[PDB]
Amino acid sequence: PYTVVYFPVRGRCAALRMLLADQGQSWKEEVVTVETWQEGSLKASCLYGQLPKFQDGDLTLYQSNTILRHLGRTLGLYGKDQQEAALVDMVNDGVEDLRCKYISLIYTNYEAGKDDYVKALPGQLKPFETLLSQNQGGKTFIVGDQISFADYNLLDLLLIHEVLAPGCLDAFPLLSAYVGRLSARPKLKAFLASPEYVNLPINGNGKQ
Amino acid sequence: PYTVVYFPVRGRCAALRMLLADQGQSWKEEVVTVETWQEGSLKASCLYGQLPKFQDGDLTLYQSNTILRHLGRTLGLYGKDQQEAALVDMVNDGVEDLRCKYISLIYTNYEAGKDDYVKALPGQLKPFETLLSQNQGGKTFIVGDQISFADYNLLDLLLIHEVLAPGCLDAFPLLSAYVGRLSARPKLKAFLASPEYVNLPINGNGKQ
Numbered sequence: 232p233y234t235v236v237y238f239p240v241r242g243r244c245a246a247l248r249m250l251l252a253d254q255g256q257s258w259k260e261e262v263v264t265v266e267t268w269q270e271g272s273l274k275a276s277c278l279y280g281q282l283p284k285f286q287d288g289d290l291t292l293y294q295s296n297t298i299l300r301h302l303g304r305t306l307g308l309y310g311k312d313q314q315e316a317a318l319v320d321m322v323n324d325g326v327e328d329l330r331c332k333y334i335s336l337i338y339t340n341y342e343a344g345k346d347d348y349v350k351a352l353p354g355q356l357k358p359f360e361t362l363l364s365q366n367q368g369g370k371t372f373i374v375g376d377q378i379s380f381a382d383y384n385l386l387d388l389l390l391i392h393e394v395l396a397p398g399c400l401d402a403f404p405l406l407s408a409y410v411g412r413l414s415a416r417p418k419l420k421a422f423l424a425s426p427e428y429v430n431l432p433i434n435g436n437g438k439q
Numbered sequence: 440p441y442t443v444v445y446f447p448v449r450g451r452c453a454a455l456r457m458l459l460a461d462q463g464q465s466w467k468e469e470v471v472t473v474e475t476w477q478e479g480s481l482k483a484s485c486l487y488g489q490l491p492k493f494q495d496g497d498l499t500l501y502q503s504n505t506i507l508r509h510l511g512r513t514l515g516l517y518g519k520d521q522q523e524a525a526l527v528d529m530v531n532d533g534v535e536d537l538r539c540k541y542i543s544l545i546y547t548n549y550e551a552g553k554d555d556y557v558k559a560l561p562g563q564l565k566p567f568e569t570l571l572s573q574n575q576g577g578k579t580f581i582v583g584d585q586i587s588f589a590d591y592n593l594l595d596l597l598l599i600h601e602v603l604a605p606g607c608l609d610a611f612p613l614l615s616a617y618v619g620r621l622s623a624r625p626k627l628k629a630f631l632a633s634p635e636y637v638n639l640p641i642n643g644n645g646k647q
């Protein structure tokens with residue numbers, strides 16, 4: 232089946248977990264403590280010396296976006312055709328870009344850079360609002376009329392930014408509605424309310 | 440047909456260009472000067488306010504990796520099956536990770552951070568050598584026995600690092616052979632020797 236090896240944080244596994252849960256998939260969580268990580272052996276065996284590590288049967292994957300694309304490809308959450316698959320990629324790459332900036336802030340200069348980051352946020356979120364406006368008036372998903380792996384990734388990005396900058400989505404009616412809508416999907420809603428998700432910190436350094 | 444809108448640099452378009460050329464595809468280059476960029480209108484119309492911008496018929500794409508995956512998907516350079524597609528993704532994500540560090544060095548702190556970056560290089564390259572060692576002894580491609588978009592992306596990464604740190608591939612027989620082998624592919628070889636490629640700077644700030 233599936234197994235996700237990660238530290239006890241939502242971080243880069245939040246989206247793939249939301250995906251798995253919403254899609255009714257079963258998976259095993261192999262929690263890696265800082266102690267175990269610092270020992271060195273596990274890290275050494277990781278392709279790029281990092282987590283998450285994912286296992287689908289005997290297929291071992293690394294890279295959160297690889298895991299997302301894999302599940303998307305195998306679970307049919309990658310568009311209806313090639314054009315949509317490309318658009319799904321375009322959205323995900325955008326999410327990744329902002330996620331990297333977020334991570335940089337959180338771990339590199341939260342205190343000094345938070346204000347600047349927040350002033351810049353609107354411009355970083357606008358693209359997704361625009362994508363939504365061009366897709367059935369933002370009444371469905373980020374791309375096409377079926378959910379994709381990019382949706383879960385974008386939803387997580389939006390959720391964590393809501394924590395970082397409460398109200399940041401107020402200026403974006405489509406994104407706000409979108410978040411409320413996806414969060415309301417039965418299985419996802421249940422997962423987001425579970426201790427499994429709720430009792431895990433967003434990041435590893437206690438900042439958010 | 441195809442059209443790539445970018446600044447007159449290899450940068451993030453080098454891999455997709457190598458791909459297009461090696462695959463015998465025809466494409467139009469729409470060069471964007473710093474003057475034109477600074478005007479503001481073009482940037483404003485770009486989804487994430489950045490280039491490259493790519494056009495395939497009336498399909499407009501943004502994000503270099505999206506373009507790479509799109510061409511890979513439509514040109515059959517994305518693995519033979521889902522398992523390979525995932526591995527191809529894992530390689531590309533790794534390449535992207537190192538490319539971001541490279542770009543950060545080049546534009547953020549070349550002078551002060553070059554030495555540290557270079558000492559760290561071996562550890563950053565090892566994963567690709569390992570991937571090669573696990574795939575037909577590195578006699579073929581990065582994943583499987585057919586070329587993928589990740590190959591062009593990895594090749595570019597290796598080529599630019601050779602310029603940054605001459606000899607960095609000496610400790611890696613598989614990567615070295617791999618570079619020599621792919622660079623020898625007829626169409627690619629011709630492209631790499633063309634003014635189109637040769638007379639374009641690797642980066643926009645003149646560093647490399």
Ligand SMILES: N[C@@H](CCC(=O)N[C@@H](CS)C(=O)NCC(=O)O)C(=O)O
Nearest residue numbers: 242243280281282283294295296536
């Ligand atoms: N590009 C990778 C990044 C992975 C990453 O940054 N992993 C961090 C935690 S989220 C890690 O393993 N840190 C431990 C280390 O680098 O030693 C991905 O998307 O999975």
Ligand SMILES: N[C@@H](CCC(=O)N[C@@H](CS)C(=O)NCC(=O)O)C(=O)O
Nearest residue numbers: 328450451488489490491502503504
């Ligand atoms: N994640 C994007 C990054 C694009 C990017 O960084 N573009 C730069 C040049 S390589 C740019 O457009 N700079 C101009 C600007 O940001 O205003 C991609 O992979 O295409």
